[PDB]
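Job type: complex structure
Entries:
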Amino acid sequence: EEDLTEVKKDALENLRVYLCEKIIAERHFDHLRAKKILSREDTEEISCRTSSRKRAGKLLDYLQENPKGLDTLVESIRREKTQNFLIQKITDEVLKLRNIKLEHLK
Amino acid sequence: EEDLTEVKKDALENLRVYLCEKIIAERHFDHLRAKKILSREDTEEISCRTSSRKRAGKLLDYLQENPKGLDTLVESIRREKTQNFLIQKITDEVLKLRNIKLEHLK
Amino acid sequence: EEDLTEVKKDALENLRVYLCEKIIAERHFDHLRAKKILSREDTEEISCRTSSRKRAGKLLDYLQENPKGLDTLVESIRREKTQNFLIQKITDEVLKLRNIKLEHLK
Amino acid sequence: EEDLTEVKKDALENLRVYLCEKIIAERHFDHLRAKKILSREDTEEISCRTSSRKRAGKLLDYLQENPKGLDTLVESIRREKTQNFLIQKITDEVLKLRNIKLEHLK
Amino acid sequence: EEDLTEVKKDALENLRVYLCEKIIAERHFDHLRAKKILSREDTEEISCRTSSRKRAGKLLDYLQENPKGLDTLVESIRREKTQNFLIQKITDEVLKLRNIKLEHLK
Amino acid sequence: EEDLTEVKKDALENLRVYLCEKIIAERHFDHLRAKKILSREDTEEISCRTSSRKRAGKLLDYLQENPKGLDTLVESIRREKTQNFLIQKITDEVLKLRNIKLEHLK
Amino acid sequence: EEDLTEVKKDALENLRVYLCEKIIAERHFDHLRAKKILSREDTEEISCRTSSRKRAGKLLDYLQENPKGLDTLVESIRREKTQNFLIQKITDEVLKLRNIKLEHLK
Amino acid sequence: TLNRLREPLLRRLSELLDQAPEGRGWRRLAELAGSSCLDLEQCSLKVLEPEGSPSLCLLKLMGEKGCTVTELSDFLQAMEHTEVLQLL
Amino acid sequence: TLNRLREPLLRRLSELLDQAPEGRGWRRLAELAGSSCLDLEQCSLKVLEPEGSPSLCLLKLMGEKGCTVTELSDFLQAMEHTEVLQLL
Amino acid sequence: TLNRLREPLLRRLSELLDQAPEGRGWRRLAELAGSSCLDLEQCSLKVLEPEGSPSLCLLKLMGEKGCTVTELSDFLQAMEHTEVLQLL
Amino acid sequence: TLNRLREPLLRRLSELLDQAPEGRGWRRLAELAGSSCLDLEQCSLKVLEPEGSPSLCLLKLMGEKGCTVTELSDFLQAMEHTEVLQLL
Amino acid sequence: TLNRLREPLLRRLSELLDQAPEGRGWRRLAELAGSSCLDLEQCSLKVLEPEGSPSLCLLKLMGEKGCTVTELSDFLQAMEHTEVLQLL
């Protein structure tokens, strides 16, 4: 409907503080696969700040604008490491989307 | 009574200079949880100035206008780090509210 | 009836001092969406004065003359940030309109 | 017809609030390629303000006056990063132009 | 018939108190386009008085004498800003003219 | 013939509302090169008013009186930035002069 | 002719976006050899910003003003590393100069 | 579910609810006094239209989501809005 | 499509529409009572000319965009402008 | 095995399962309350598509791996989802 | 392959496709409703030119890559763009 | 190459080109209708001088870069500027 982008941005915003748990793979997840849609310079900008938590914050800040953030989910599947409970997270993620979609149906 | 908002603003104003102590977690506290009610652009505006003390000042300036500033208190509980004496602070905070409420009863 | 414009101007005038609370988003709200009906030069004129409160005052001064000020309400919905209690405000806003409309029925 | 400039300015004005999404590459896009038509001093003026959103606003303010704003579109193609959905944007952009052109035909 | 000038002056006189609404663009509208028929010194004379409402009053005072006041209408079209409801105004304006013309037919 | 000054003033007056487009370089163009013929105090007087459009208006007001306004054209060439379409403008400018000169030949 | 400086500045401006490719040796190239003409403080100013691309941008910004920017070319020869295709670049560089010089001959 | 109350006689209900100088009104009607949020805002937004009846929105929505047949009457009595009972 | 109504007898139609002391006029004629915007403004602008007939603009445009042959007659009857039916 | 339930009337089943404000939903439907893992994730992934129905995936898979004919009805009753029994 | 449709009468086709107030237009024409990507962007870019006809690009490209002779007619009928069939 | 057209009779050519109320003029003369850029600007700049003849610049430059002997006559005929042919 060209409107599920909006619900996806809302879902990411609602799930904001669950980033700190397992997306401390900031250098680990996106800076290789997400380079299909991100910028090289964006990687350096992310790596600039030394909070190791704010870093993932600006990563997701960049991700929000892009309509196809599902790539992150795809990347989540690839690395089986956190997957088993990133599955939890993705189920978490999936669950959130479900909720929002219901509210869109009103 | 739709009037405890006023006493809350007054309490924050009275407790203004106790911000400097432990709310130097400006980037730390609000810019993740308080994004449920704050703006992304507001975060950049806060991060603009390099006083590291005035920064929390404008944070609380933004917080005063919003009727539901109790979210900050909620956030205070979440991070157990300062909590133990942020408890002190929240008790401090709580104490202030009590006083003001009494004066409202006149 | 081509008369609800008058009641809308009256409602804005009555609600004048509730602008200071959350419409400190002067640069934030109108200078992008309201450019569908405002002027570029009007934006500079608004940005001239450095009171940060009088600024919103002249914003609403410009808004009063335009018959379709409901755009502001529309803009209020778009940014979900203050919305949750701008909802309060818009309910506040809505409430005011109701009252005035009743008096028009006499 | 020396009139498609006018429809281009109108298209940019109508699409104003879609700047915030992906043109947060203000320092990123124009300050290198657009220096073929922009000024060095204009770059500093853009970089002055620290809203990170208003910044793109004044970028587009400068772009509107120049008759050949299609350079931006050209620049959009060059960086493949946002392109894939900047394509969306450019298709978005393209779509807007189509609409306006139709209205010019009346 | 070299008589529609008279009906135009009458229309402006009848519509006198609708100037205050949107012709607060006194410096904005005429002092650039209307310089094709106005004087430079007339601009300074208009800018002398600081009522910001009487100012438009003397603007229209000057406009009444000139036979071709339709230029103002032309200028109204150019700035799309108030246009959308200046359209209303111009329709308002147009409506007035219609009425007067009918009375001329007797 | 000591009369092309008059046609030049007329050309500037006719082209008055094309100033707003690219002569927003008011501080940018004249306040350095045109100081060969302008005054220091005139620069402050120009910088006084905060319309950012009226500012160029008074700039051209000062320029009209001086017989050798071609300096502006010269300055237009120097900054290659707007030049490419300031060329358009200067061609625009040039075109205007041509027209007026023809009418002088009668 | 004391005019080939101008064509050199123009050549650098035209070749602006070819800096990103191999002049990522910002710390590498100039901060040792170019200290014959640069400042120590200028090195720190360059090293301030963490874009790793904008950094070379301000390097070339400093280089443009200096009449003898050919030192960079000299430095390009010294480090044989990029040379082999910096040769390409310098040939690229050389080619650009040729073109501009031709246009100077008109 | 659809209440399907007679529309010409529904206008009287909406008018009576709208002209409510009592502090209790359509909002307190929505509170149910003993008991779904954004839709309230959408109903409130329908005040800007010339024929704006927030009661109409709050009843068409309440006509669905439960066929309120005299079920609202009990709460209306609890609201001291006996004029509805005095009329219907 | 072109209505191509007789121009000498079209003048009567335009005059009758223009001299409309009734609140319903060319504007309500444009509303169609049951139903393309900027062109309305351009037609309205043709009042400043000495021989200004907004009805002429609204009929030449309506002559195109649909060959209105007695189709406008039904709506005109709905407009209580029976003088058109009394004439044509 | 294929359930081959009527597809036009299967849409009602999927919609009813999806709109489940109760904490019990398609997940607890999958738990079977008394009882094959990665495929659950693949079914969950089909939410990103505009016409995303996780119930559709969980029923087409359950249509196979056992021809569930009213066998799911017993567990659905155990799930207090009597609206399915109220409908089919 | 080259369609080689009569260019003077091809202009009518391009104009009819361009003036498409219907939500279906040249884009949905490209979707084929049942079915090569970057070239679409290049065709879209040809809007900035004064004589910009995206339909021209989408037909010259479709003239090649398959000599579409009345093959596009079937899909155009499927697009409810019967005015093409009403003309050619 | 140098055209070396008679200067006293060249003045008539420049005057005829300058007094060109037709939209086609020295600019369209430069377009050649079927066909070197900055020099055009330099020629245009020679309007500020009291004896400013842009045609003079565009012909002295065209006198060089090709000895235009009646070669410009064909294009001038294509420009409908037959007064040149009526004179020379």
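Summary: Chain G is about 75% helix and 0% strand. Residues 1-106 of chain G form one domain.
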